[PDB]
Design a protein around this ligand. Structure first.
Ligand code: TPP
Ligand code: TPP
Ligand code: CA
Ligand code: CA
Ligand code: MG
Ligand code: MG
Lengths: 980, 96, 125, 375, 125
């Protein structure tokens, strides 16, 4: 057909040479053009035979009957093929068989199989089948069923692989083959009572198959049948099944302008710098305008901000063509190993910008968030940031106008979606009472590889995105070569997210152009895959030819686009070449405490309180008006004062509403009705009726660790002016979220600068309830502490914890405070605090005994010095009171990091007759505070801590001993060692 | 003041005055243009504000995202007082 | 340990170790998969934990496959004091299993005859 | 008819030359340690993220045909003795998913289900191990103790200070040492290919089920200095403590030493080349290959050599609050006070992240420690 | 059952409704089953029109009529009251079945036979 169209194009424009006419060995004429049924042509010399193709039409007799009559019987059009031959060589048998052979081809299946292969058609061609003699009623149920089968597994027989690696998925399905459902090409023109298929109650079979093709078999795979909500399935059919309008030439031109800047950006990055073989968005440039479509739709939808969390791949391209940052602020201080790394830190940093609608009438905010090299680790952090901004706007969940104007645009790697486990925890928190974001747009960029690990070995599912079906998320597997399709899929996802407030997943099937290393030819591992990519064309240049070929654009429009490509390529190369040459009161009055103490008994009219909780409310009324305030009430007084001041408090953790150890009771539930009551929300309204502006957010987190910690961290980033607190059930379970601590909390304020104002309450206490119910592993927090990055603290008195929270909530300085709340010491009658502690005092980083500070205590009498931190102080003080050992002093180090150098040097100068120093901790030797203190103290304060002894438990691989009897012996061993 | 004043309404540099008082005033995503309207949508060469006596015809010169005068794609148009001339994402207003 | 669902990948590693030892299942001439992992789970721990997904991804890999696993979730409709509404964003806790096309049989824990049939049918599958 | 990839082809011929002459790089030494175990009759299960080809194009345990796409394993050929008899050993090499928690939990469960198996898990970079921190804290370290589930797993963690970012440099050794109890694990940091070869063979044939946490290098794989002769693989054993080559085999004066350097990683090669440039015969460098348990006897005997030593230093590329110093600086003057009392530390400044983001900063900081230990 | 006066539609018109209702009971049989032993949400049984027969243009009069149910309980023809009794005991009893979301066809066919059959009552032993 290429040689036919050359001879046709040249004959039409009079450019045929005489060397074309000389050589006709066999000719063909078409008298059937003028309706002449058949002809007996005259055969010229030099030709062996000449073929006279007749008129392809219905015979003369049928010309008068209705079409509905003809197709219902099974009569078809025909061509009267003649073959006038030369008898001097060709005989009747050969010419008769030659025409028979032609007939066999024109009705063959392999003939059309070969033609469809050459024309780039992946679908099964029509086969010559003789009419099914079944009635229309019998055929109807087959056609109804075939329609349902196409919706359930239409995505499997879809042309969504741009590399066309598996050619068998288009033929390995009898549930989608029409011939299998008792149907033939004769039934194609018959009407079937398809109840609400394309809206129409009656449709011709050829229309029914073409609708299903353009809806579920084209470049968009639709998987929506698994969704449990019915209106959502009805909704997707109203969009997918409609014969979609071809986009305008102006819309197509904006797609090509967005693809010109994306292909030129990666052209510049793979030229200007080296080592950029990794992070090369070549092949997936289509994801740049895909995100643009999401954000253009969002602005049209009346939304405020789109927060993007994405991995290292093509991140600089997004920063310039999507966020809206100039090339100048991108390559300011930019930086050849065989292994991949981080390169310039811009690949981690998150900058903000603004998006102006090209065709619409609105402008929307586009911000990017910081993430480490750990794939999908940012997922819960982004959903926490989006929720922080929504709550701030009096919109979404915590607001009068539940719009959810902040939209999370989360991008992911192909193998990283099915691979990582965080992916599931994040989906679980996408629709919770105090965690929902009202839907999230997920764009997985399936490059069909992961370094050298085959996608087959990286997932146990057909699609990578099959994890999303946990929450009924519709999946649209779209081809990354068709940009017009990618935009439609992206814009449709926005409509779904705005209509149902549910996460949507777009699988962009593309190809990775080059390996992750500069000297990496991954054709060692996948030779067949990279053999195809070798012969592939750029997703911008290929789309350019398609618009010319389809008659959408002209050669003048091809010059407008080609000049724009060079105009944007020169734009960044010259801008970079030019820019290179130029190179506090922490206490409240007692009347505030009495307001919080009365809020526990300010129950609504007819609120039947549970009898086990009922006396706790009355006890807190007594504590706020007299004293002996336990840790449980002190915790609520610290936050209760901050809410009444006007600050937002977000306390949420595993069973934190009631309290892990029945101590918080921030939410009390009616025994008869089941209504919830929050006493801390009463403080958000001043006595004069005026709202303070503060708010109390208390929720119960799922059985998650990684995402529970990552969400609260993201909240303190999205809203710094918020007291964000996360309480674990037991400190020991924090190792699940170790990536959030190591990569986001400790090194957050430093690697990038994302200031963390999060408080991590970790129940720590040596009681012997097992290794997983005792030590919250302090040794690790101290091990990753740098000068001014975190604030590790271990309070001993309820008053000190009160000042600690108030100090961290009103310091202004964004620094993560890791508090270690006690477990048994909550109900300890000794661990109480008077009113004068909460009113006439400040936070104490170092704490002396009560006899030396307030009572009549002799500091000279002290010879033996004890240094401690946890509840162990109360056991050492009672042991001292039993033996009247006036030679032993106990000092507490409340702030473990930074070490209170000045507060401790001044305090150590008191008690001058001290001749021995000890660090008494319940934790083992290799664990606790000794591994850091025993090496820091004689190096920082050698005038006192030189020759420091250690009175602690033996070193174990687990935080504590399994048997409860063993713990009692070991706890008494340390008490006798420090008192002998 | 005797000549046309284009004031950008939508764009990064919104609320800016420019004067078309020459037989040829150049606009585009390149510094070799009098009105350097910078953005990824805008092409290197976009449109000209030619002045013929007492007439201002804003003419397109091979741009990908065309030139829309009052949301209408044109190749040559005699711009009148108060028109939405669009170059990529930018939208300016004519004044006489 | 006390960490819920933490032993999930450890059990599937133990079952695979014994399958390879017996010259059956994935590594050997036979393909019996004679070692069957009976994994029991907490109601909020199936949807709430992330390891659950990583573990299901391993259930059918070239050198990780165990040839199927019987999972018996004990949905007691509670987790200490957290309601299942605040513990999962799906109708069932077991909706996580849908990742690999795992058939889910929501049976009543009061009818014993039904529980036995459901359990025995799972073995057949 | 196996058409090998031309990029892989010379690496096959180089390993034929290395086994018959010497200068065996870390990459071939790794396969020789397991290749001998398979031929002996032991099961080897090496699987990790992109471990089949090798994270840094070094393993090549499986090579794929360029024309056909067939897989070829050279270590499985050793499972059959020359006389046709099968040895009983097997090589299991797979590419794990983008999983951390389950990838580590699966290999651990394999060493419990089959103790008589060399189970090895290789991370892409050591820094990504924090995802599976629950498997390390609850099953590996406290497994052999809380319940008694004996772990015979080997965790290869690519560790090397090159400056490719905080998530592509330090595998956080400080934490492994922090949770180490008397005889629960075996943390190790090899410096020579021969030592790593004996380390794996020793752990694979000791009988004692103990998790060996090996820290494989990244750049030092292709380092021309980090090689080993045949004499090391044949006429030698595992060395928990390692002296310089001039004092042990060459003509080296032990008395000339006044300045004593203690190190562990690839940093030794930079300190030895700096010493060779300035001919500083007063500086000796001893390596602590087995970090835990500390080789008390092997080090006391070695510390008695070089008697004119008047100063001791611990030189590590890792920051001050990270690396080995937080444990060593408090253990060494308490266990061996006759030598390590008054030990000085030559290392990087304390950071909250394992390394600095910019590559230029790493070059300055790495040179600062080299000039501090040589002045 | 509710007193509803006969649907004047033909059997052909009623057939496609009955075919669709069978698939609707297969997709969400679990959503209206008695699998909650505490019977906390009594509305789950009534909050589903895709399973309500009256919604699919059917009455108690159509209960004794034959419908061309393509391979429902093996039989190509069945009375409506028989069709709704198989679906009740198979899905809405104490075993909710989520087998329609699986992509392998023979697996769906397999569960269909083991679920849509009047299963024998277990022996007294
Ligand atoms: C948590 C984590 N573990 C390991 C790595 C090392 N790594 C870098 S690229 C890669 C595979 C790429 O997978 P995918 O997410 O599909 O990225 P893409 O191939 O699309 O670039 C891996 C394992 C990582 N970056 N993050
Ligand atoms: C990983 C982990 N985090 C926290 C806890 C603390 N905890 C003890 S009981 C409980 C809730 C129980 O939930 P579930 O898994 O539904 O238990 P079930 O009663 O169904 O067995 C929690 C959070 C735990 N045991 N494991
Ligand atoms: Ca603050
Ligand atoms: Ca062994
Ligand atoms: Mg990928
Ligand atoms: Mg429970």
């Amino acid at each position: 057909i290429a040689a036919y169209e050359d001879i046709v194009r040249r004959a039409r424009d009079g450019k045929l040479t005489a060397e074309d006419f000389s050589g006709v060995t066999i000719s063909l004429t078409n008298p059937g053009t003028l309706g002449t049924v058949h002809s007996v042509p005259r055969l010229m010399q030099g030709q062996g035979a000449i073929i006279g193709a007749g008129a392809m039409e219905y015979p003369a007799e049928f010309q008068g009957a209705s079409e509905e009559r003809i197709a219902d019987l099974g009569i078809g059009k025909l061509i009267t093929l003649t073959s006038t031959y030369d008898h001097r060589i060709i005989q009747g048998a050969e010419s008769g068989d030659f025409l028979r052979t032609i007939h066999q081809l024109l009705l063959d299946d392999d003939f059309f199989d070969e033609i469809f292969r050459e024309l780039g058609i992946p679908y099964e061609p029509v086969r010559w089948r003789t009419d099914n003699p079944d009635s229309i009623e019998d055929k109807n149920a087959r056609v109804i069923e075939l329609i349902a089968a196409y919706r359930n597994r239409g995505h499997l027989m879809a042309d969504i692989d741009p590399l066309r690696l598996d050619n068998t998925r288009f033929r390995s399905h009898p549930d989608l083959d029409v011939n299998s459902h008792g149907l033939t090409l004769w039934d194609l023109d018959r009407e079937f009572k398809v109840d609400g298929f394309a809206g129409v109650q009656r449709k011709k079979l050829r229309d029914i198959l073409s609708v299903l093709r353009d809806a579920y078999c084209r470049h968009v795979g639709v998987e929506y049948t698994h969704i449990l909500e019915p209106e959502q399935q009805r909704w997707i059919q109203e969009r997918v099944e409609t014969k979609h309008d071809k986009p305008t030439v102006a819309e197509q031109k904006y797609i090509l302008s967005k693809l010109n800047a994306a292909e030129a950006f990666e052209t510049f990055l793979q030229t200007k710098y080296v080592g950029q073989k990794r992070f090369s968005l070549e092949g997936a440039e289509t994801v740049i305008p895909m995100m643009d479509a999401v954000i253009d739709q969002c602005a049209e939808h009346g939304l405020d901000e789109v927060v993007i969390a994405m991995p290292h791949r093509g991140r600089l391209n997004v920063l310039a063509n999507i966020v809206g940052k100039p090339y100048s602020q991108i390559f300011s201080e930019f930086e050849p190993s065989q292994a991949h790394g981080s390169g310039d830190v811009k690949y981690h940093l998150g900058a903000t910008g603004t998006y102006i609608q090209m065709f619409g009438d609105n402008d929307i905010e586009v911000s990017l968030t910081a993430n480490p090299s750990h794939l999908e680790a940012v997922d819960p952090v982004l959903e926490g940031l989006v929720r922080a901004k929504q709550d701030l706007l009096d919109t979404g969940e915590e607001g009068s106008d539940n719009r959810f104007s902040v939209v999370p645009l989360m991008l992911h790697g192909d193998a990283a979606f099915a691979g990582q486990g965080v992916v599931a925890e994040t989906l679980n928190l996408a629709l919770l009472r105090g965690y929902r974001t009202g839907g999230t747009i997920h764009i997985v960029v399936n490059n069909q590889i992961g370094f050298t690990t085959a996608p087959t070995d990286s997932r146990s599912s057909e699609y990578c995105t099959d994890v999303a079906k946990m929450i009924g998320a519709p999946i649209f597997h779209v081809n990354g070569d068709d940009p017009e399709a990618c935009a439609w899929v992206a814009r449709l996802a926005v409509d779904f997210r705005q209509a149902f407030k549910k996460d949507v997943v777009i699988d962009m099937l593309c190809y990775r152009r080059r390996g992750h290393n500069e000297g990496d030819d991954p054709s060692m591992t996948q030779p067949y895959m990279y053999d195809v990519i070798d012969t592939k064309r750029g997703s911008r240049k290929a789309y350019t030819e398609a618009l010319i070929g389809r008659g959408d654009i002209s050669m003048k429009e091809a010059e407008d686009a080609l000049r724009d490509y060079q105009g944007q390529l020169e734009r960044v190369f010259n801008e970079v070449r030019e820019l290179e040459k130029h190179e506090l009161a922490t206490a409240v009055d007692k009347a505030m405490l009495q307001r919080i103490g009365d809020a526990h008994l300010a129950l609504p009219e007819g609120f039947t309180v549970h009898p086990r909780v009922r006396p706790v409310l009355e006890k807190r009324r007594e504590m706020a008006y007299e004293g002996r305030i336990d840790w449980a009430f002190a915790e609520l007084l610290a936050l209760g004062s901050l809410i009444a001041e006007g600050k937002l408090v977000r306390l949420s953790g595993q069973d934190t509403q009631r309290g892990t150890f029945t101590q918080r009771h921030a939410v009390i539930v009616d025994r008869k009705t089941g209504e919830e009551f929050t006493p801390l929300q009463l403080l958000a309204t001043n006595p004069d009726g005026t709202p303070t502006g503060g708010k109390f957010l208390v929720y119960n987190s799922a059985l998650s660790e990684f995402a529970a910690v990552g969400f609260e961290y993201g909240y303190s980033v999205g809203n710094p002016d918020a007291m964000v607190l996360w309480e674990a059930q037991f400190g020991d379970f924090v190792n699940g979220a170790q990536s959030i601590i190591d990569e986001f909390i400790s090194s957050g304020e430093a690697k990038w600068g994302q200031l963390s104002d999060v408080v991590l309450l970790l129940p720590h206490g040596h009681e012997g309830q097992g290794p997983d119910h005792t030590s919250g592993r302090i040794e690790r927090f101290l091990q990753l502490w740098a000068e001014g990055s975190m604030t590790i603290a271990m309070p001993s008195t309820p008053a000190n914890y009160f000042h600690l929270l108030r100090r961290h909530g009103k310091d202004g300085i964004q620094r993560p405070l890791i508090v270690f709340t006690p477990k048994s010491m909550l109900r300890n009658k000794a661990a109480v605090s008077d009113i004068r502690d909460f009113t006439e005092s400040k936070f104490r980083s170092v704490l002396e005994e009560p006899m030396y500070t307030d009572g009549e205590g002799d500091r000279n009498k002290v010879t033996r010095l004890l240094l401690t931190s946890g509840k162990i102080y109360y056991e050492l003080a009672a042991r001292k009171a039993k033996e009247n050992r006036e030679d032993v002093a106990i000092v507490r180090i409340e702030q473990l990091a930074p070490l209170p150098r000045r507060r401790l040097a001044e305090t150590l100068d008191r008690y001058p007759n001290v001749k021995e120093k000890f660090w008494v901790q319940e934790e083992p030797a290799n664990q606790g505070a000794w591994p850091s203190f025993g090496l820091t103290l004689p190096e920082i304060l050698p005038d006192h801590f030189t020759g420091l002894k250690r009175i602690s438990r033996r070193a174990m691989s687990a935080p504590s001993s399994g048997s409860s009897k063993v713990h009692a012996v070991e706890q008494q061993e340390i008490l006798d060692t420090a008192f002998g | 003041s005797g000549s046309a004043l284009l004031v950008v309404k939508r764009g990064p540099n919104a609320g800016s005055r420019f004067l078309l008082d020459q037989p040829t005033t150049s606009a585009g995503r390149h510094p070799d243009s009098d009105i350097f309207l910078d953005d990824v949508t805008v092409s290197r060469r976009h449109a000209e504000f030619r002045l013929e006596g007492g007439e201002f015809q804003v003419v397109d010169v091979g741009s990908l995202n065309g030139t829309y005068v009052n949301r209408e794609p044109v190749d040559s148009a005699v711009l009148a007082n108060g028109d939405e001339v669009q170059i990529g994402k930018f939208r300016l207003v004519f004044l006489t």
